[PDB]
Design a protein around this ligand. Sequence first.
Ligand code: CA
Ligand code: CA
Lengths: 323, 323
Amino acid sequence: TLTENKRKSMEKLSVDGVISALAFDQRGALKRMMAQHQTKEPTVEQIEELKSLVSEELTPFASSILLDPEYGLPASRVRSEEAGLLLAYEKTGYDATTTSRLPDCLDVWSAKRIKEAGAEAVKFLLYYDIDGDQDVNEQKKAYIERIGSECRAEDIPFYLQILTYDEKIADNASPEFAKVKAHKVNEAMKVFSKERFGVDVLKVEVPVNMKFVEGFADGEVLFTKEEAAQAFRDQEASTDLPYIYLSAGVSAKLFQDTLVFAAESGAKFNGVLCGRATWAGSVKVYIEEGPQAAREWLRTEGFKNIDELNKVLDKTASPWTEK
Amino acid sequence: TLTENKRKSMEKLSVDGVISALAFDQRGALKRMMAQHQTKEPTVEQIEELKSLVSEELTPFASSILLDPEYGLPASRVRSEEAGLLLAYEKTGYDATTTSRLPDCLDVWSAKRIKEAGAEAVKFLLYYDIDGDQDVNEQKKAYIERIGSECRAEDIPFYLQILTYDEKIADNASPEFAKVKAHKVNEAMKVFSKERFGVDVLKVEVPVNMKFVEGFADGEVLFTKEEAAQAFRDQEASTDLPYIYLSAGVSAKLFQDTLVFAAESGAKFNGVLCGRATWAGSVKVYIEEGPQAAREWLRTEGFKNIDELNKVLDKTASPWTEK
Ligand SMILES: [Ca+2]
Ligand SMILES: [Ca+2]
């Protein structure tokens, strides 16, 4: 169920019950991309400006935009008046020396402060290995309970992003991980759909690596179209919450093709929180050719990208209202 | 204002609006006391047992008991039927290699789990130097906001304990700290009485080191009685929340005389969360003579301490229900 304010907030993040959200809370990742044509270390001014350019030019075509409080608050204030705002709550990345990947909130932030900054949702990223250390997962579950409680008190939607992994499989893109991905994703969704975690929307991976599915694979084939289709249906059955897809390790085209396949298979996903593929190109242009060039790229190539995505969403997504 | 459930919980922790609570969530501190008396490391069983003995013998004379989830859950189950339960939420102690003393919740606990474990309040201890690093304090304030929000969502009273310190003063028993203690205590109370922190009751230090007050001092005198009295009045004017005193491990007699002085000075404190001043002597007995001897100490010296404290509370404390 949703409280009146949470419902209203959800409405501000979507169009006709579909979430077509632009993800741009990248921090370290964006800086690194920038580093790729580096006269110097990329500045705070540069990072914040590029987020503002993307926000200004592309949010007229997105139902909402996800930003980080570190670099993204200026960008958040210049978003289209028709677009809602989500703010990221987690610290980026994880310790590569250990396998625990424990969650940690931004040090001077709280759900209250996120709401005060104008957000209509709190977004939090959790790494979860359902088969991992039981004590680690207990600590993780407790952490999410806390955040869910915060969001209930502040009456602001809780968007929980889950990225799955295996403590013992180094590469998420490996065939080894592909074989267990459906299990990692769908079981994690079952866990955090439980009422006690206070989640309003799940941001999740597609439950299969399409690069190993028949018809989509350029190399080894691990799954038939039917087995992949069943994974999407299993995922649909793993939660009664609204859920939306993230894009990871795939091109814009493959992602869009996957949304088509997802819908064809019977998945009732309620939209996406996608970004990188849409605005990636603007980054090279911005560093090299300046902000005015980047603005033009976003107005042209940028619009093309997000518009193609929206037209795919129009024929594949299902409304969260239709619960 | 209290919600219906918070009020009911406050009622279970109090009698006629006065909190006569027994504090025994000590961990590191208890371990240190125990250290003073034996060769070996204290065992889990010994810590759990002594906590259960104090709970069994003394909670018939307290309106509630504060315990720690780590060693205190068995003790919580054998408390008097008439006594309420608070559970601690913070990890014990602080990092002595730095001056920030940052707060940290127990890893596998949440406010929801504390409530599920039968507690009628969440207690959290924060070290705070009002004059300290501003970024450190911003992080501390954000952290308390989160907990206050949790407690609002779970509809469970939030007891915030504040222990003051100075980043540049090593010993809080020193005359140097004594001269700034009132400032540290009263300004901290003011800050954490702000609505945004969601506190229901403050557990605080008396705003004076009584050992340096004329009439109480056996050595150097830093303060006249009128100056000490004014600090208590300043404290009363620093919050409109209920507040209760901790004993800080002074003698039972000095704590009792302090409460009388507080009341005479004009402090409208609403009770105590008193630990060491009551049961401290049981530790030596339990270690050296065993549980039965400790039980007999509690039934005699322990009772005498808490009985005389209750008599003093009866004539000094002010009801929270008058608010
Ligand atoms: Ca107020
Ligand atoms: Ca007052």
